Amino acid sequence: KKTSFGSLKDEDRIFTNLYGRHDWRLKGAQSRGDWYKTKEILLKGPDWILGEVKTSGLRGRGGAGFPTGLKWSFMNKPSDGRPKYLVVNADEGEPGTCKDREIIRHDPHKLVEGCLVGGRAMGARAAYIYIRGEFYNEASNLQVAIREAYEAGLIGKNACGSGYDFDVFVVRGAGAYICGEETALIESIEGKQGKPRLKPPFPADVGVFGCPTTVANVETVAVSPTICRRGGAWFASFGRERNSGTKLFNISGHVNNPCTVEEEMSVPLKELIEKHAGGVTGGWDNLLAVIPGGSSTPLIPKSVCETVLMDFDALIQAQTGLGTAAVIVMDRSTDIVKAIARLIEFYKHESCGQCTPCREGVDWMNKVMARFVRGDARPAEIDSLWEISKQIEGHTICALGDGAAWPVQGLIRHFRPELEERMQQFAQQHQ
């Protein structure tokens, strides 16, 4: 089998206009292979499409990493009289994550085609694309791209000439990270506070407007047409087994050339940073820690970063997760406690407030972490903060509560001596 991963080739890159160097409107999208044989894909039936997605091994690119073909197949069932919908999650709110932004504005027709192909698989009559309200220009690009498809017969009535009616609506958010959560997104579309729903019922049973719904990430849906064209096996030939395909990576923070890039799954973390980002600032030896999958994932220290791979299973073993694959790099000049304290401050401002452990607990964690930054605490409080985070984790309605706890646990797990040192400095100064 393949034993090393990375060094992906342009011939095998899905998002070929990632950098906006080519025309983003329909004429460019067609010349690059979009909307080609879309009718054939639609006339092959949902069961064929879901099988292609099932065999590709695609896993959700929104953060949870749930296998996609299995998830989409929950909609594969007879209608009971309600309409069926595909909600596309373009909220892109996780700090460090900006991959969906490039897809929306530079490759909008891949998303629009993905909506139709995935919508056909689920039997949906329309797709609502929920895009965060701060992406006004990207949302206008998407509506322009959607208008071209409607004018080409590629969507709407008799889409592509397949006898299938599909609408693509774009609805904008109004400023809330919690509206990236699948059920909180649905409540936002319905015109409520973006507060998540409890499960059950699952969205495939009772979703937007109370109807069967599937929420899919923009990247998850944007690659779907290509997997159907080139086949699931082609996509599954990349990355480790169960970690298939090509992934978008955002390398930010203390790198020489922060960038977004498409790279094969299971690429080493070290290679990814050096190859595309130009390496850590001040040399690889100047690395302190990396947040590998967005703010919700725990950080890892330089020692783990040496050999860890970038895929779901590799990063779980390092006591973290792939998340959105947003790589935030911190060099040794970083005040690590301050950096993690700022993320807990972020979750504090983003918690919807609905449920007790996050409404009260995250704010409590923020107040403690602020004192840790200054050392105005006692070493016994470190174990108390670990216990508090475990009272939030797994007890909240939605996974924002877990995402607030994990960064705190990562800091305590790998940088406890730093925390104690700061308390030592504060105590001896006021002594």
Ligand X SMILES: Cc1cc2nc3c(=O)[nH]c(=O)nc-3n(C[C@H](O)[C@H](O)[C@H](O)COP(=O)(O)O)c2cc1C
Regarding 329 and contact with ligand SF4 (CB under 6 A), the answer is no
Q: What is the pairing mode between strands 326-331 and 246-253?
A: parallel
The enclosing H or E element of 277 equals: helix 269-277
Please, what is the minimum distance in Å from the beta carbon of residue 353 to ligand SF4?
Answer: 5
Positions 340 through 379 that interact with ligand SF4 (CB under 6 A)? 351-355, 358-359
The enclosing H or E element of 112 equals: helix 108-122
Regarding 408 and contact with ligand SF4 (CB under 6 A), the answer is no
Positions 134 through 193 that interact with ligand SF4 (CB under 6 A)? 178
- Name the nearest CA neighbour of 414 among 333, 313, 297, 271: 297
Please, what is the minimum distance in Å from the beta carbon of residue 90 to ligand SF4?
Answer: 19
- For residue 154, the SS3 value is coil
Please, what is the minimum distance in Å from the beta carbon of residue 279 to ligand X?
Answer: 29
- Is residue 239 a known part of a binding site? no
- Is residue 208 a known part of a binding site? yes
Nearer to other proteins, 104 or 368 (CB): 104
Positions 141 through 180 that interact with ligand X (CB under 6 A)? 177-178, 180
Regarding 153 and contact with other proteins (CB under 8 A), the answer is no
- Is residue 192 a known part of a binding site? yes
Segment lying near other proteins (by CB under 8 A), choices 54-62, 189-197, 237-245, 372-380: 189-197
- For residue 141, the SS3 value is helix
Nearer to ligand SF4, 253 or 401 (CB): 401
Positions 265 through 324 that interact with ligand X (CB under 6 A)? none
Positions 192 through 221 that interact with ligand X (CB under 6 A)? 215-217, 220
The enclosing H or E element of 252 equals: strand 246-253
Q: How far apart are CA 304 and CA 307, in angstroms?
A: 6
The Cα-based distances of 359 to 344, 347, 348, 350 in angstroms read: 13, 10, 8, 10
Regarding 209 and contact with other proteins (CB under 8 A), the answer is yes
| Tokens describing residue 238 | 């990349």
- Is residue 206 a known part of a binding site? yes
Segment lying near other proteins (by CB under 8 A), choices 89-97, 153-161, 366-374, 408-416: 89-97
Q: How far apart are CA 36 and CA 32, in angstroms?
A: 9
| Tokens describing residue 361 | 């607990």
The enclosing H or E element of 86 equals: strand 85-90
Between 127 and 146, how does the x/- string for binding to other proteins read (CB under 8 A)?
Answer: -----xxxxxx---------
The Cα-based distances of 151 to 134, 147, 154, 305, 331 in angstroms read: 27, 6, 8, 49, 50
- Is residue 175 a known part of a binding site? yes
Whether residue 253 contacts residue 305, with contact meaning beta carbons closer than 8 Å, is answered with no
The annotated binding site for [4Fe-4S] cluster is made up of 352, 355, 358, 398
Q: Where on the chain is the footprint of ligand X (CB under 6 A)?
A: 60-64, 66, 71, 89, 91-94, 177-178, 180-182, 215-217, 220, 398-400, 403
